[PDB]
């Protein structure tokens, strides 16, 4: 099966500070965040719907012996996509940069204000990669906005 | 796949209505077609599949039935209905007609 | 929509007949021609399926070799031949108008009848 | 009749499960204590919570059941995939079953985090729609017992329509939580 | 009775290593068969005292029949036989002596 | 693991007389119908290809015992998402109206006949929630019938 | 869960001759290739997975005992559908024309050479279905594919 | 050949699966009776349906072929989702096995809803694709028992092309039709 | 798209050389700049990469600390320094246009070689 | 990674087929260059990659050869083809060059 957990709240997400480490609030508008709802190979929205589902648990179910393992298990298949982790998993087996869930990056309009959806920063020799090394990745990265910023 | 019927014979007066029957060796998941003969005249389609009806077909003739049991009914026996009625199953090759039925 | 088949004509037994069916008002390629023989006094019997797109051909069980069916696209013409005549063969033959069996990967067959006979050829021996 | 945007009416339909039988499981609420899971319209599985044990042996002639196959396969594969997807099932001197003659009759002994919690979490999985009268989560209840029993089809739940969601649902989750009792398996 | 039938001939592997006896004055009987496994079969008349095992190193099965009586005297064949079980006409045959 | 079962049928699907308590033949059309194939969270598509599947296994094949969870066990899969309903146990979890699989809603066009994809209808308290608690839902509905419709 | 494998590489993907039998090398455009990343129902998508997975394997990790049950194991599900083949076999048993991932067919524009997505051949009786008996699928399939180069 | 609307030419290709021979096992059918699955380029099962048995005995003895490290892994694993994929297994004495020597010999003794028909259900999906001609399902077989036992690689793909589909179909299905055998699995 | 290396220099053991060359025919911030140094009568040997854009530097595991490079995007150019000299360090330095390497996450590896070369400097102590 | 290679001369007249190998201390999936050298020249990119021409380059050099073992072949030898060829791997940091066959 696929994920059914749908992303709380005009439209779009916020990360509180909570959420981030040495960063404030941080929101995403509804043209980036609707794209979390259809990609099946997106980490950013894999993890923020595992961020959406724990602020959920917490602030309606009650808490209590902190044994929360058997309602994680219940459903971890509902929140992200194993197969994604699993190619990542290949891609550090084969000698290839990886990303391990924990830095993104994300393009942000000056004026405008409108960002673009963030992508994982990859990693090689446990270390990042530099931004000239995947810097033609960026360049895509804009030029697809630019499109959407047509119509 | 062999398919007979039974009655061959309907000897029955206009007016009232008249019906035929259709049994099949094996499956024929509504995929059987009714046809219509007159004496000397080429074969005609009434019915194809289960329940429905060609093209200019009068409303009196009514297809029914699945499986391996079909009823072709006719309520209102007209003069021009006095025919050969054949029964071919399509389900599968080659295709099989019956043995017909004499309506009189 | 009608379909003529060519008359009819008796001859010796033991020789071949030709019979043919010329298909008017609708595209002649997407239909197959079906072929159907009638006893006399017996009821309807089945031969073979030629579809006139790439002409191929599926023949009855008990009518392989003795019977032959093709088409010509040109004249828009299916043409039906039996090599040895016998007692038994007298009939009469239909051409009828089938649409060819469609499967599909994303779909569910859809099988069709004889829509269109035509008048029949009669062959006595 | 209200009309929406001045275009649009509002109309419901309801689906008919009753006639899904004969390839899927239709589970059901008769009331409180009493729930059905049907195959065919021939044979079923009652759920009951009771005060009253029928079985008082904690005894589960289970190799000797397959050895002798008397039994329903269909009613034995359902009870399997309900024991299997029993959260952290630990306490095996819990379940007392009885096999004898082909029939199947299973008793759950449910005297948090204990095996009466997965015991229900299983069941109202299984009879969803109509188990929520009787409630993270950790579940307890007043019942001390869960028998399942074999029984004959008829109209028995009227508190809610058969439904196949339940079973469907405890089919994924078979072999997720299961502890290892032994190093080779 | 510890008789032997080493052979080398083709592949030890696919058939049937059996024994027959023929006492005097009487027809064959067979006594005993073995595969290139350890599995084996035997003649219910004189299963209780019988007993074949073989060895695939050297390419040879071994017979051995205890409580030896001159009742018992006869004249002993091994054989190697091939059963087909794949198509219809199922045969078994006794290919070499 | 995706579904892969196409629903039978111009284009779209009938909901006979059998399906449906209290009813006779319904029929939704092919824009409605082509949703079902692409997306994964719509409760509808998923019982739709249960009963579609019900009625082709009893069509092509035998019955002998009824014992046929065998089938289903094979291609339950293959024809609904088992997140959906895990994701319908979570909301039922956290004291919030979940989707019960017996009630439907949609939309019809008073003269074009045009229908929307039926919603399944929340229930709560063990009963059905009143359209004066969902007309916000409603409205939606209705606002992309009428986007489509221009297109 | 979902396949996260994209393809190798402008954009197209080119199937060698070691791939194919009596046949030469074989290239299929960007247009056709794309959307092998969003189907979840073509033979030929996940095929082309397999082979792009066992040359990547082959290229950059090393081989000894052939003990590689392992690796396909592991990365089974990240690159097939098993509800597809699980659907196959359904159709297989149904007595209805099926696909065993052997056979495909694709259009070829004679002069622009664009072609569309190779769908898998149908098998009947053991045999390889005329073409006579899927015509209108062809059709169905050329007409969509001048419908999106219309545009 | 015929040209689509006078602009389109319709093109076929046939892929090659003896390629994948380093990363998946490859199954093809010799004939009626012969079928093989392939791994590597040396290795490979032959699975055969016989009137003809070759393991007279009951002994499936797996502990002592466990603490005996001698059988190839591969094989070893492919066999154990074969014995997995089996549904409603519970004659444990319709099969025998022998692994002295490292090598693999299993038999499945096959003499409705009966352990034959699980049998050539998975043996079935295996096979898939030409194992058809030795054929709801309520699979029936003239074969008495089916054999599994080694082999080299040869050429053996003569009446199916090789194809890992019925080996990546069964990883699926793999333990989701066990009966329950104990209490704390 | 040629590479002026700017004449060749003689300068004594112990100071530091600083040899520079101006690219022109592309954007230079696209592709970095690969030293490669040329023993007199031996093979070449790889110095280190910077790249223009943003400056990003990977230098060679010897030639760590002893060997440093700078870009200036206003002039187009790229430089080498080398603090101190030995009597095995004349040779002859080249300066070789190449393009970063590419990752993403949804591709594979992209990796590139020196595409044009620049007239070699001598550099003889 | 170490690369190595092995012929280092050949003595070859004109008109025939030259033939030089490099040989990689590990796997460098087709992340190979073979550069030409003249005296007193700079290098010029031949082939990059497995056997992909650089722009302008005449036919008769071709590459071949994946993971360790390459080999670079020249067709026909003229005048101008005689200089120093070089292997280069870009698999890895840092690069690693070949000590070069002087053509003669
Ligand atoms: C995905 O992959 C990336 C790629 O590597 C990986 O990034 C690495 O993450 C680790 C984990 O945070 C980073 O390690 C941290 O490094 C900082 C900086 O270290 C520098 O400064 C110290 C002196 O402070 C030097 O000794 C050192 O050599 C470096 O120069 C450390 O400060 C971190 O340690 C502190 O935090 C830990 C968190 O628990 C504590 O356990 C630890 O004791 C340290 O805390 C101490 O100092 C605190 C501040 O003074 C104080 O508050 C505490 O009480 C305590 O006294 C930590 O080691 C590493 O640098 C990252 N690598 C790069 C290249 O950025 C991701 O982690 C990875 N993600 C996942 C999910 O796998
Ligand atoms: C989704 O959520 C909804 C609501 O939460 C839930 O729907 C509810 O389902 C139950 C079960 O079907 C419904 O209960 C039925 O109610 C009717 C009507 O209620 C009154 O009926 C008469 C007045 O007409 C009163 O006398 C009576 O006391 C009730 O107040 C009942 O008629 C139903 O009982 C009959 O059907 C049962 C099942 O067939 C039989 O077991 C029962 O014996 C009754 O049958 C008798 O009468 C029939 C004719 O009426 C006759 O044909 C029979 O032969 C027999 O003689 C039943 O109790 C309830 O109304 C629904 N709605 C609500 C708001 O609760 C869904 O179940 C849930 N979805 C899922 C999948 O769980
Ligand atoms: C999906 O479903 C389809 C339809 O069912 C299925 O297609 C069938 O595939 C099989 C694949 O094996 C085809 O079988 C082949 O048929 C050819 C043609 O046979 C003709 O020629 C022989 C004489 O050689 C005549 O006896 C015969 O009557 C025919 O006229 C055979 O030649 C093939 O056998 C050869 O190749 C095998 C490969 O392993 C060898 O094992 C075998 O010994 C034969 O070798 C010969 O040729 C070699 C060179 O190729 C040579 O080196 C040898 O020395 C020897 O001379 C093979 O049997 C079958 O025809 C297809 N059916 C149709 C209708 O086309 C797909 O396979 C299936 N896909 C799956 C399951 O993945
Ligand atoms: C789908 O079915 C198509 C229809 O095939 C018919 O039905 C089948 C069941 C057979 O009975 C077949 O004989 C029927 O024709 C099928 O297309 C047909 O395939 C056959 C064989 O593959 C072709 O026959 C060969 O034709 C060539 C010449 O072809 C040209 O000329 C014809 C006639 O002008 C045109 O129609 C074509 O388009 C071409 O322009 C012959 O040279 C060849 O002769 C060889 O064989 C004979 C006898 O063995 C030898 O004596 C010779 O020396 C040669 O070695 C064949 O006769 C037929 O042309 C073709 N028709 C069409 C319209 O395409 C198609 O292959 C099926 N698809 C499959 C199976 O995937
Ligand atoms: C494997 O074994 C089965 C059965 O084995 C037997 O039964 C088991 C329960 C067990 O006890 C075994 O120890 C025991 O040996 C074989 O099953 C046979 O199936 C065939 C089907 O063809 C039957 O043969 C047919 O029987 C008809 C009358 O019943 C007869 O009319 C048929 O004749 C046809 O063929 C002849 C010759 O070509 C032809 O001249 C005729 O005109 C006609 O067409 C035919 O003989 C057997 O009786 C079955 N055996 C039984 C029931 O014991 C199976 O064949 C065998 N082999 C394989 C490969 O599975
Ligand atoms: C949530 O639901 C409970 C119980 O709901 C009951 O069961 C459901 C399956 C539906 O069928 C409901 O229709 C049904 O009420 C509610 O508690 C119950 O509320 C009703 C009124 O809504 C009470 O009925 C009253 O009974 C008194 C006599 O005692 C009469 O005088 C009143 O006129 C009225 O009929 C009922 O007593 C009460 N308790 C029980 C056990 O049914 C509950 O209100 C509802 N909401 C919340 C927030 O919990
Ligand atoms: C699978 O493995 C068993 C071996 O394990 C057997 O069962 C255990 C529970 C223990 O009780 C072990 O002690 C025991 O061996 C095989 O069964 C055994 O085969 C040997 C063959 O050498 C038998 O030994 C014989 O024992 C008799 C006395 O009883 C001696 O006179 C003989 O000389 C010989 O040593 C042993 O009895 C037998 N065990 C049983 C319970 O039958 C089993 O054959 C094997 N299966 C396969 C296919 O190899
Ligand atoms: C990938 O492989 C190694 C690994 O890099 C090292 O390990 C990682 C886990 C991180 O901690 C890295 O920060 C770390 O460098 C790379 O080799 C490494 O190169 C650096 C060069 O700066 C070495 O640092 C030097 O160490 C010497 C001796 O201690 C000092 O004198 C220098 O001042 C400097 O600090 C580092 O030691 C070395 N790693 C090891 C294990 O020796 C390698 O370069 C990298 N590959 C690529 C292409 O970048
Ligand atoms: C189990 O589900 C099946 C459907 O899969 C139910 O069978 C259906 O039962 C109804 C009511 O008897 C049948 O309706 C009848 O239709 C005929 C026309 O075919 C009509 O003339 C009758 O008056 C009647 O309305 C329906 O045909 C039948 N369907 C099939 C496929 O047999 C069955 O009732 C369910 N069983 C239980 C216990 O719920
Ligand atoms: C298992 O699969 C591998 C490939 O996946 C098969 O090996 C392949 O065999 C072919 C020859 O049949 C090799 O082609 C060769 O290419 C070189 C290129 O220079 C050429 O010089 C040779 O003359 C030959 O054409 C191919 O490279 C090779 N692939 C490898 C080794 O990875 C192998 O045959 C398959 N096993 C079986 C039992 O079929
Ligand atoms: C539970 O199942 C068992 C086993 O099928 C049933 O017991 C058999 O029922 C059949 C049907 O009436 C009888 O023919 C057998 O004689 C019964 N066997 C025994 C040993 O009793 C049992 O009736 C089922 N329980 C219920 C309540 O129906
Ligand atoms: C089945 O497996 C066994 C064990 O791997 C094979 O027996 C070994 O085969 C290797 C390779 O030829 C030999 O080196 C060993 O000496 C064999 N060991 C024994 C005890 O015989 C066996 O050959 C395989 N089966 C077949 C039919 O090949």
């Known amino acids: 099966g696929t994920f059914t957990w749908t992303l709380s709240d005009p439209g779009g997400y916020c990360l509180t500070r909570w959420m981030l480490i040495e960063a404030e609030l941080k929101c995403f508008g509804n043209t980036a965040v609707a794209k979390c709802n259809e990609k099946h190979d997106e980490e950013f929205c894999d993890m923020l719907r595992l961020f959406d589902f724990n602020k959920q648990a917490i602030q309606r179910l009650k808490a209590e012996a902190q044994t929360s393992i058997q309602l994680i298990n219940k459903a971890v298949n509902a929140l992200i996509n194993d197969q994604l982790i699993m190619k990542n998993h290949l891609r550090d087996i084969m000698g290839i940069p990886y990303c391990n869930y924990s830095k993104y990056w994300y393009l942000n309009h000056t004026t405008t204000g409108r960002t673009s959806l963030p992508k994982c920063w990859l990693v090689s020799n446990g270390s990042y990669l530099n931004e000239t090394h995947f810097s033609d990745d960026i360049e895509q990265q804009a030029d697809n906005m630019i499109t959407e910023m047509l119509q | 796949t062999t398919l007979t019927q039974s009655p061959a014979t309907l000897s029955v007066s206009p007016g009232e209505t008249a019906t035929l029957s259709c049994r099949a060796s094996?499956?024929?998941?509504?995929?059987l077609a009714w046809y219509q003969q007159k004496p000397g005249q080429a074969p005609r389609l009434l019915i194809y599949?289960?329940?429905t009806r060609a093209t200019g077909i009068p409303a009196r003739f009514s297809g029914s039935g699945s499986g391996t049991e079909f009823t072709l009914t006719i309520s209102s026996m007209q003069s021009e209905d006095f025919a050969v009625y054949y029964c071919?199953?399509?389900?599968?090759?080659?295709?099989?007609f019956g043995q017909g039925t004499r309506l009189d | 929509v009608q379909l003529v088949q060519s008359g009819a004509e008796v001859k010796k037994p033991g020789a071949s007949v030709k019979v043919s069916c010329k298909a008017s008002?609708?595209?002649?390629?997407?239909?197959?021609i079906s072929w159907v023989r009638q006893a006399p006094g017996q009821g309807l019997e089945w031969m073979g399926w030629?579809?006139?797109?790439?002409?191929?051909?599926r023949y009855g069980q008990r009518f392989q070799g003795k019977v032959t069916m093709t088409t010509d696209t040109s004249t828009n013409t299916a043409s039906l031949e039996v090599r040895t005549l016998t007692s038994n063969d007298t009939a009469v033959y239909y051409c009828?108008?089938?649409?060819?069996?469609?499967?599909?990967?994303?779909?569910?067959?859809?099988?069709?009848?004889?829509?269109?006979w035509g008048q029949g050829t009669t062959v006595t021996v | 009749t209200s009309l929406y945007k001045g275009v649009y009416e509002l109309q419901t339909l309801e689906l008919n499960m009753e006639t899904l039988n004969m390839t899927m499981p239709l589970s059901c609420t008769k009331n409180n204590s009493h729930h059905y899971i049907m195959v065919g319209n021939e044979t079923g599985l009652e759920l009951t919570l009771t005060n009253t044990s029928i079985i008082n042996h904690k005894f589960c002639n289970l190799s000797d059941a397959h050895k002798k196959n008397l039994y329903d396969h269909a009613l034995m594969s359902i009870i399997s995939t309900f024991h299997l997807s029993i959260p952290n099932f630990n306490q095996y001197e819990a379940m007392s079953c009885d096999f004898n003659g082909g029939k199947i009759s299973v008793q759950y002994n449910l005297s948090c985090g204990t095996v009466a919690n997965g015991v229900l979490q299983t069941f109202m999985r299984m009879a969803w729609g109509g188990s929520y009268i009787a409630l993270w989560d950790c579940i307890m209840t007043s019942y001390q017992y869960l028998i399942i029993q074999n029984t004959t089809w008829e109209d028995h739940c009227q508190f809610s329509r058969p439904s196949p969601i339940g079973y469907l649902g405890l089919l994924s989750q078979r072999t997720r939580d299961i502890y290892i009792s032994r190093r080779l398996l | 009775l510890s008789l032997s039938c080493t052979v080398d001939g083709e592949s030890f592997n696919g058939f049937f290593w059996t024994w027959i006896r023929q006492p005097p004055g009487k027809g064959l009987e067979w006594i005993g068969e073995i595969n290139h496994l350890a599995s084996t079969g035997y003649n219910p008349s004189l299963k209780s005292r019988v007993t074949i095992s073989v060895d695939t190193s050297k390419n040879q099965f071994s017979l051995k029949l205890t409580s030896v009586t001159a009742a018992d005297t006869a004249v002993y064949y091994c054989a190697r036989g091939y059963s087909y079980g794949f198509a219809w006409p199922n045969y078994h045959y006794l290919d070499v002596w | 693991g995706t579904f892969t079962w196409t629903l039978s049928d111009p284009g779209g699907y009938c909901l006979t007389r059998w399906m449906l308590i209290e009813a006779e033949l319904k029929c939704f059309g092919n824009t409605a119908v082509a949703k079902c194939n692409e997306k994964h969270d719509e409760e509808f598509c998923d019982m739709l290809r249960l009963f579609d599947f019900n009625k082709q296994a009893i069509q092509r094949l035998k019955a002998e015992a009824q014992t046929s969870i065998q089938l289903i066990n094979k291609a339950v899969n293959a024809l609904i998402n088992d997140q959906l309903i895990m994701k319908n146990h979570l909301r039922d979890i956290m004291g919030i109206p979940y989707c019960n699989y017996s009630k439907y809603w949609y939309l019809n066009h008073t003269t074009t006949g045009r229908t929307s994809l039926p919603k399944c209808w929340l229930v709560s308290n063990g009963s059905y929630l009143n359209e004066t608690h969902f007309s916000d839902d409603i409205e939606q509905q209705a606002d992309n019938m009428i986007t489509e419709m221009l297109q | 869960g979902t396949f996260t494998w994209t393809l190798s590489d402008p954009g197209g993907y080119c199937l060698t001759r070691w791939m194919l039998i009596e046949a030469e090398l074989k290239c299929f455009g960007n247009t056709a290739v794309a959307k092998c990343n969003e189907k979840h129902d073509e033979e030929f998508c996940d095929m082309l997975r397999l082979f792009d997975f066992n040359k990547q394997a082959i290229q950059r990790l090393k081989a000894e005992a052939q003990t590689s049950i392992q690796l396909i194991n592991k990365a089974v599900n990240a690159l097939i559908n098993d509800q597809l083949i699980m659907k196959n076999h359904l159709r297989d048993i149904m007595g209805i024309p099926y696909c065993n991932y052997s056979k495909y067919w694709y259009l070829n524009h004679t002069t622009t050479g664009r072609t569309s997505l190779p769908k898998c051949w149908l098998v009947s009786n053991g045999s390889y279905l005329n073409e006579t008996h899927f015509s209108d699928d062809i059709e169905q399939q050329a007409d969509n594919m001048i419908t999106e180069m219309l545009q | 050949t015929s040209l689509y609307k006078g602009v389109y030419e319709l093109q076929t290709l046939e892929l090659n699966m003896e390629t994948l021979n380093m990363t998946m096992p490859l199954s093809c059918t010799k004939n009626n009776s012969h079928h093989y699955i392939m791994v590597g380029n040396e290795t490979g099962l032959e699975l055969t349906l016989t009137n003809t048995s070759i393991i007279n005995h009951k002994f499936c003895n797996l502990s002592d072929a466990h603490k005996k490290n001698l059988y190839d892994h591969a094989l070893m694993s492919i066999i154990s989702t074969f014995h997995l994929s089996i549904p409603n297994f519970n004659q444990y004495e319709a099969m025998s096995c022998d692994f002295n020597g490292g090598k693999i010999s299993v038999q499945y003794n096959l003499s409705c809803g009966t352990v034959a028909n699980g049998v050539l259900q998975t043996f079935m999906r295996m096979a898939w694709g030409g194992s058809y001609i030795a054929l709801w399902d309520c699979i029936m077989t003239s074969y008495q028992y089916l054999i599994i036992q080694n082999t080299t690689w040869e050429d053996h793909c003569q009446f199916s092309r090789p194809s890992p589909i019925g080996y990546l179909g069964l990883l699926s299905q793999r333990t989701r039709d066990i009966y329950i055998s104990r209490r704390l699995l | 798209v040629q590479l002026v290396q700017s004449g060749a220099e003689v300068k004594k053991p112990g100071a530091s050389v600083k040899v520079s060359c101006?690219?022109?025919?592309?954007?230079?911030?696209?592709?970095?700049?690969?030293?490669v140094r040329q023993a007199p009568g031996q093979g070449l040997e790889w110095?280190?990469?910077?790249?223009?854009?943003?400056?990003?530097?990977?230098?060679?595991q010897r030639f760590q600390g002893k060997v440093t490079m700078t870009t200036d995007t206003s002039t187009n150019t790229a430089s080498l320094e080398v603090r101190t000299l030995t009597s095995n360090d004349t040779a002859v330095?080249?300066?070789?246009?190449?393009?970063?390497?590419?990752?993403?996450?949804?591709?594979?590896?992209?990796?590139?070689?020196?595409?044009?070369?620049?007239?070699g400097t001598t550099v003889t102590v | 990674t170490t690369l190595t290679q092995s012929p280092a001369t050949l003595s070859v007249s004109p008109g025939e087929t030259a033939t030089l190998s490099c040989?990689?201390?590990?796997?460098?999936?087709?992340?190979?260059?073979?550069y030409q050298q003249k005296p007193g020249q700079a290098p010029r990119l031949?082939?990059?990659?497995?056997?992909?021409?650089?722009t302008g380059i005449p036919a008769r050099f071709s590459g071949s050869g994946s993971g360790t073992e390459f080999t670079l072949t020249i067709s026909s030898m003229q005048s101008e083809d005689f200089a120093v060829?070089?292997?280069?791997?870009?698999?890895?940091?840092?690069?690693?060059?070949?000590?070069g066959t002087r053509l003669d």
């Open positions: 030629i579809s006139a797109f790439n002409g191929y051909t």
């Open positions: 071919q199953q399509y389900n599968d090759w080659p295709r099989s």
């Open positions: 008002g609708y595209t002649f390629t997407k239909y197959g």
């Open positions: 599949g289960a329940s």
């Open positions: 009828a108008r089938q649409y060819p069996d469609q499967y599909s990967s994303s779909g569910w067959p859809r099988l069709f009848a004889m829509d269109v």
């Open positions: 094996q499956n024929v998941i509504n995929n």
